[PDB]
Amino acid sequence: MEGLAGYVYKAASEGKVLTLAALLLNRSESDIRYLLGYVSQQGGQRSTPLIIAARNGHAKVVRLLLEHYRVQTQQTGTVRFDGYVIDGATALWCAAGAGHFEVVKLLVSHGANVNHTTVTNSTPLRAACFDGRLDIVKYLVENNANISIANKYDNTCLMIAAYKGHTDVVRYLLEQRADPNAKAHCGATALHFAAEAGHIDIVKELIKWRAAIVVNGHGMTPLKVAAESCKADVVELLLSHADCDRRSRIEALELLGASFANDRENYDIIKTYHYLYLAMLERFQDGDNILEKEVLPPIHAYGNRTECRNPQELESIRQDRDALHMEGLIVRERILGADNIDVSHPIIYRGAVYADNMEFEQCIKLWLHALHLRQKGNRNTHKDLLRFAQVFSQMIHLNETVKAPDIECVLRCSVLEIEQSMNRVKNISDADVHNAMDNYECNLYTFLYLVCISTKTQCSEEDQCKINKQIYNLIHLDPRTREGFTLLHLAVNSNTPVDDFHTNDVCSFPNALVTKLLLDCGAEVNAVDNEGNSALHIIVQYNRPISDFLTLHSIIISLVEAGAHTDMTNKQNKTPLDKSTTGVSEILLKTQMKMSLKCLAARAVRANDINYQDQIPRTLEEFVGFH
């Protein structure tokens, strides 16, 4: 029966009245009304024949359905655009999103319900604003569309239209007395959206309506937002339209200069120097009436970090573009503060370019500041910690790493914290965070790479003690992976994701020193994965015995010590001696294997099937289970 629904869907997508009529003809009234009510979620989005006709922009099909079949226009579907899914949208919403003017004309002329209840509170006017068609917006608004209707984020149609940057729709909505004073969830105003868009005409139109200057939650006044977005024209327009004190305009000018210097997109130091010099002359313009200048305390990350306050002080800094950039960073960090996370992007970039070729030191300290900032926030830094891993690989390849253990201890604390946080995240839900489970695995890999870095380097015994404190903190809590794998199991298996930036002379699996240090920490040797495979069961399977024979010999002689059972059957009977395939690995085991009567008795009593339940001390039940 659903085949008829698919045929109607295809006919609606085609746009032919003849095919759709023929498919709907020779069917009962109930059948055709069920076809109209049915939604074929081919892409997982509800789309009734009217809804999908509106989305596909076929005027003929929409006209036929509305005129001859009386399909309900109040049907709402969770249509998705560019991956993002709106959880509710009527037929008129899809018509506006399609961008076809005849379809929206017909649907509105057939009494389409513009105001439809929706969990996302989406409206067809918002869809038209997203599409940007002025004519569709006009036709929707004229025929009973409430512009004041906003989504769950309190984002109105006018707000998103100003964000888009289309001057026509903003002008039309302002003509229809659309209120721009509504506040979104963040509380930003329409002036903030216009400054972000960078359209001077939108800002001028908003000023014409006399929109109030309202500071957002994290500061971010419209002049400050425009200065951050490098909208010099918008900043000048706001300063001219709204009177500001000396402090406000001087701060705006210096923020604009520092933003121009710091960002890689602009990358103009002459404009930055000119703006800073102008602002500081404005500080001293009056004469004996000087704006109070504060100096941030010196920080080892920024070096001297002396914020200059006199004209000769910047005059001495005409050259040394690095000094100008770091001073702009100081200015931006002082003005903006650490309240928001917007300053996360520049600092790393300022490190990144600095990280092109040099000792990495103040780059590392800048990234440490970025780490602190991102750890105040609940923002995932697994990509960032990867980047630190490749940077460490770079410096160890350069052989000039001379690494300081304080930084590695700090990043170990951070990675432990994020491990715990994302473990709780998986404790909340699983399906949505499957990619977060992939990041779980990746972060375990990063810790192994950090352990490989620590093994390659060497430092003071107290620093090693702190490293071992952190690794024991990670070990005491028992990490697990899909199908179950301890740290040792990864450390002995062929860990597929070897660092691509540096895969040679660094991070090679089947390592001996890593396993030695992990045993020193005290990981549970007799831990069993799914199917019960022990550590020895995933080291005798090595396929290159004659090469790298030193590694195999060392790992075997290390794991045989620290108490590892010589025989530990698991699921189907597989002794470590049976599973070995090389033909060379058996020798190393049989040299180190130590015999005892317990093992022989257990093998004898399990080979034959004798009852061993409730006739044996409870401890030996597990012993018999092993052998």
Stretch that binds a second copy, among 345-353, 530-538, 542-550, 573-581 (CB under 8 A): 542-550
Pick what 278 binds: Zn ion, a second copy, none; C-beta below 5 to 8 Å, kind-dependent: a second copy
Return d(Cα 240, Cα 325) in angstroms, integer: 29
Pick what 232 binds: Zn ion, a second copy, none; C-beta below 5 to 8 Å, kind-dependent: a second copy
Angle between helices 513-521 and 434-456 (to 10 degrees): 100
**Residue choice 549, 561, 571, 607 for contact with a second copy (CB under 8 A):** 549
Least distance in angstroms from the C-beta of 44 to Zn ion: 55
Residue 624 found at the interface with Zn ion (CB under 5 A): no
Q: Which is nearer to a second copy, 457 or 541 (CB)?
A: 541
Q: Which residue has the tokens 């650490």?
A: 338
Binding site: residue ranges? 185-186, 218
Least distance in angstroms from the C-beta of 223 to a second copy: 12
Token duo for residue 330: 């100081």
Return d(Cα 231, Cα 223) in angstroms, integer: 9
Phi-psi category of 223—alpha, beta or left, where left has phi over 0 and alpha has psi -120 to 50? alpha
Task: Report DSSP letters for 428-443, one per residue.
Answer: H-SSTTHHHHHHHHHH
Residue 239 found at the interface with a second copy (CB under 8 A): yes
Stretch that binds a second copy, among 10-18, 516-524, 545-553, 617-625 (CB under 8 A): 545-553
**Residue choice 235, 308, 395, 559 for contact with a second copy (CB under 8 A):** 235
**Residue choice 233, 438, 505, 621 for contact with a second copy (CB under 8 A):** 233
Amino acid at 276: L
Name the 3-class secondary structure at 157: helix
Pick what 273 binds: a second copy, Zn ion, none; C-beta below 5 to 8 Å, kind-dependent: none
Stretch that binds a second copy, among 15-23, 151-159, 229-237, 288-296 (CB under 8 A): 229-237
Least distance in angstroms from the C-beta of 560 to a second copy: 16
Pick what 239 binds: Zn ion, a second copy, none; C-beta below 5 to 8 Å, kind-dependent: a second copy
Pick what 285 binds: a second copy, Zn ion, none; C-beta below 5 to 8 Å, kind-dependent: a second copy
Residue of closest CB approach to Zn ion = 599
Contact 255, 332 (CB under 8 A): yes
Query: What is the 3 state secondary structure string of 571-624?
Result: CCCCCHHHHCCCCCHHHHHHHHCCCCHHHHHHHHHHHCCCCCCCCCCHHHHHHH
Sign of CA dihedral 21, 24, 25, 30: negative
Stretch that binds Zn ion, among 186-194, 252-260, 507-515, 598-606 (CB under 5 A): 598-606
Residue 557 found at the interface with a second copy (CB under 8 A): no
Contact 390, 502 (CB under 8 A): yes
Pick what 475 binds: Zn ion, a second copy, none; C-beta below 5 to 8 Å, kind-dependent: none
Pick what 41 binds: Zn ion, a second copy, none; C-beta below 5 to 8 Å, kind-dependent: none
Stretch that binds a second copy, among 30-38, 162-170, 405-413, 543-551 (CB under 8 A): 543-551
Least distance in angstroms from the C-beta of 546 to a second copy: 5
Decide: residue 127, CB within 10 A, 0-12 exposed, 13-18 middle, 19+ buried.
Answer: buried
Return d(Cα 445, Cα 244) in angstroms, integer: 54
Pick what 1 binds: a second copy, Zn ion, none; C-beta below 5 to 8 Å, kind-dependent: none
Binding site for Zn(2+): residue ranges? 185-186, 218
Site size for a second copy (CB under 8 A): 22
Stretch that binds a second copy, among 80-88, 140-148, 191-199, 583-591 (CB under 8 A): 583-591
Q: Which residue has the tokens 């789309």?
A: 47
CA torsion angle for 38, 43, 46, 48 (degrees, to 10)? -50
Token duo for residue 333: 């960090």
Pick what 409 binds: a second copy, Zn ion, none; C-beta below 5 to 8 Å, kind-dependent: none
Residue 546 found at the interface with a second copy (CB under 8 A): yes
What would you report as the CA-atom Rg of the chain, rounded to the nearest whole angstrom? 34
Kind plus residue range of the DSSP H or E element containing 419: helix 405-428
Phi-psi category of 201—alpha, beta or left, where left has phi over 0 and alpha has psi -120 to 50? alpha
Restricting to residues 247-286, name those near a second copy by CB under 8 A.
Answer: 270-271, 274-275, 278, 281-282, 285
**Residue choice 18, 587, 607, 616 for contact with a second copy (CB under 8 A):** 587
Pick what 236 binds: Zn ion, a second copy, none; C-beta below 5 to 8 Å, kind-dependent: a second copy
**Residue choice 599, 601, 605, 624 for contact with Zn ion (CB under 5 A):** 599
Q: Which is nearer to a second copy, 19 or 248 (CB)?
A: 248
* Residues in the chain preceding a C-to-N separation beyond 2.5 angstroms (breaks): none
Residue 281 is classified by DSSP as H
Q: Which pairing describes strands 76-77 and 89-90: parallel, antiparallel, or unpaired?
A: antiparallel
Q: Which is nearer to Zn ion, 16 or 606 (CB)?
A: 606
Name the 3-class secondary structure at 106: helix
Helix and strand numbers (H, E) in the chain are 32, 4
Return d(Cα 159, Cα 193) in angstroms, integer: 7
Q: Which residue has the tokens 């900043």?
A: 235
Strand partners, 90: 76
Q: Which residue has the tokens 């395939």?
A: 581
Stretch that binds a second copy, among 68-76, 341-349, 395-403, 544-552 (CB under 8 A): 544-552
Residue 513 found at the interface with a second copy (CB under 8 A): no
Pick what 599 binds: Zn ion, a second copy, none; C-beta below 5 to 8 Å, kind-dependent: Zn ion
Binding site for Zn ion (CB under 5 A): 599
Binding site for a second copy (CB under 8 A): 232-233, 235-236, 239, 270-271, 274-275, 278, 281-282, 285, 544, 546-547, 549-550, 553, 584, 587, 591
